[PDB]
Ligand SMILES: Nc1nc2c(ncn2[C@@H]2O[C@H](COP(=O)(O)OP(=O)(O)O)[C@@H](O)[C@H]2O)c(=O)[nH]1
């Protein structure tokens with residue numbers, strides 16, 4: 001199930017992040033109530049700090065495609081998101097030594113920056 | 120810079136024109152009585168005018184006898200000249216057919232798409248286009264679907280072509296919570312697939328446009344779910360129209 | 367695929383219709399009271415197809431025809447409810463049968479059609495007999511067909527339509543009526559047997575040596591043809607068993623479904639035929655254009671498909687040989703791009719009074735000759751605009767004539783295309 | 791217009807009301823929209839007494855319409871043997887041509903009026919006359935499977 005995104009074993013979390021990344025490509029622009037990674041943004045704030053470098057990077061690219069699937073209406077709730085998300089993104093995504101873990105974290109911040117009215 | 124409606128022109132009243140020997144002539148057993156009766160008000164009373172009276176004019180006595188013939192009248196000629204009357208009302212009296220008027224003729228018209236005589240299908244469909252362009256999608260969206268599910272092959276292909284006609288001229292902009300989305304997957308798509316999967320090719324081929332005119336409106340990604348369930352062979356026919364179709 | 371609903375419309379419709387019921391009632395061993403006095407199981411094996419009492423509906427705007435049927439020999443057997451008749455007649459006006467007077471009555475007919483279909487285990491389709499030069503049989507028949515086509519679209523529509531000829535009625539509006547009716551049949555029926563009065567007269571006059579053929583004389587040839595083509599349908603048999611299978615193996619292109627029927631041997635009204643023909647003789651009444659019920663020369667065109675029905679006790683080995691022979695010894699006359707397009711079937715029960723017989727149903731492109739004749743007469747009439755006020759007065763538009771004219775010519779062109787086609 | 795009432799009568803076939811309208815000096819050769827005189831219309835619809843009435847009052851026996859149709863054309867088309875011989879006796883054009891190139895012999899042959907074909911022939915009809923497409927009356931019998939007509943055309 002989806003609740004396996006917080007499962008103990010890493011390779012089962014790694015699935016859920018890929019499963020999610022599909023969801024945000026393949027699900028509805030209008031958006032299923034199953035797309036509730038807005039009104040609890042603590043979820044992905046947790047996922048970005050995964051405690052596994054490979055399953056972390058996969059959570060960030062799921063957050064990334066989520067965070068561009070949200071350029072559809074109405075998502076005025078991007079204020080809450082920047083508060084919850086970019087501190088984890090900066091603290092441990094930009095920080096990362098991993099080439100791709102960093103590159104997608106910056107891209108994520110970009111997408112949160114243009115969610116906002118200004119910088 | 121805003122534009123004008125040319126409709127500001129003063130209106131004309133036709134109620135006084137009708138003759139005493141009209142109700143009995145339309146309700147007669149002799150076909151030529153009915154035809155002439157209808158044909159007279161069309162060539163003499165409706166065709167001349169260019170704007171009917173919005174204020175305080177009840178046509179829902181006249182319109183319900185146009186329906187009575189369009190549905191049940193055995194004379195295909197009396198149907199043809201009636202649906203052209205219906206169109207004239209809906210055309211010269213825009214913004215009138217809110218419900219009572221539009222709904223009084225809507226389901227009769229959809230029944231009579233069964234007619235295959237080109238001149239008659241011309242007149243019935245063009246009148247359906249009138250009631251739609253001034254009442255879309257009040258009652259038609261629902262009832263148009265109903266008659267896509269109908270047993271006669273002709274009414275299926277014609278009422279589906281109707282949804283196609285309407286969909287090309289479908290209008291914005293509320294939020295994306297218009298009547299089309301409330302019932303999109305639940306009803307519109309489930310019913311358009313019944314056309315797409317019909318036994319006849321000419322029926323199926325109308326569905327293929329009416330699905331590619333649908334994707335154009337509501338995103339080829341949203342409907343990729345029932346696309347997968349469809350044949351790979353039907354898929355490339357649907358896509359064929361998607362590339363040509365405009366809304 | 368079991369039951370068939372039968373319809374007869376107009377004067378001709380009920381004439382050749384009743385004659386047909388006379389013929390196959392005897393063949394199945396039914397008396398005019400409606401009781402079995404046969405002596406074979408192959409007679410009641412598929413009696414459920416046409417009977418319940420016939421599954422027959424009788425239609426005419428002309429009320430007189432009612433009595434001409436019931437006062438006939440087997441007139442007592444038809445269900446009284448299944449008679450549906452108008453007050454006045456159409457008077458050779460197709461528009462009156464299709465739009466005005468015939469349309470007012472057509473609902474009453476569909477009510478009976480529904481009734482008879484309602485109590486069918488599994489319907490096959492329908493069977494309409496009618497003339498094309500009339501007003502009722504053509505105008506109301508074609509309107510009935512379309513009205514059934516849309517109420518029963520999962521069923522076969524099979525017509526026995528008889529073509530007008532100056533040799534049988536000098537009425538000049540018949541080309542109009544028949545052209546308008548062909549414009550319907552090409553769009554509305556799965557298969558149509560073209561019975562040509564031109565050819566029925568030419569057979570009664572030249573082959574049977576009757577100086578003045580009556581309707582009864584022409585109707586004898588028709589009723590015998592109908593029992594012949596319906597032999598597969600009415601008795602047990604492997605090939606061309608039901609209406610759909612027949613049409614599947616007979617009609618390669620939907621619009622080109624006009625069969626040129628013909629059968630053998632040609633007998634007179636109750637005359638004696640000493641020495642029953644041999645199998646090779648029967649087989650050699652196929653190309654023999656003097657046996658075609660349509661006035662066309664198979665030599666002048668090509669067969670797309672052919673169905674042969676041999677009736678009587680005879681050598682299945684010899685029939686196969688003779689048919690396999692006549693095909694390849696005339697190989698240029700059968701289309702090459704349809705392999706095994708000729709199909710033969712045998713029924714052991716022969717026709718009435720004859721030891722052997724053979725009916726020859728053929729989709730021959732030569733049939734374009736028939737539609738040529740009708741169109742030239744139509745155009746000659748239409749270019750001078752004669753009698754148009756009849757049709758237009760009944761609500762018809764002058765345009766309709768042009769469309770029917772053009773649509774029949776497209777039908778002629780299509781036949782000409784596939785005639786000149788090559789396999790290479 | 792009194793010339794238009796005489797067309798209405800001669801067509802629909804009210805023998806008596808022709809005499810009434812003609813006694814009021816109606817135009818015996820009055821043309822309708824397409825150039826059809828009353829003699830055309832009576833000869834189309836088979837009103838023999840109306841034909842003979844108009845002819846003896848000076849009807850143009852060889853009058854054409856907008857399409858070159860003489861009354862003998864229309865009588866031979868519809869098959870009015872009684873009228874054909876009346877027209878011919880009043881000096882009708884046996885080999886008249888119309889806009890489509892047809893003679894009266896073409897029309898009587900197409901419509902299978904064998905009795906009228908023989909009358910026209912004996913009044914010196916052109917058996918070898920051709921139409922627009924290039925077909926004679928004899929070609930029509932060949933094309934239309936009418937061996938009864940082929941024999942009557944070579945008599
Ligand atoms: N073979 C045959 N042809 C007929 C018979 N009666 C009429 N016809 C033909 O049918 C045409 C006239 O149409 P008819 O059926 O009498 O008119 P309806 O009653 O309005 O359908 C003409 O071409 C006639 O030659 C008949 O008993 N047998």
Ligand SMILES: [Mg+2]
Nearest residue numbers: 377428500502
């Ligand atoms: Mg009749």
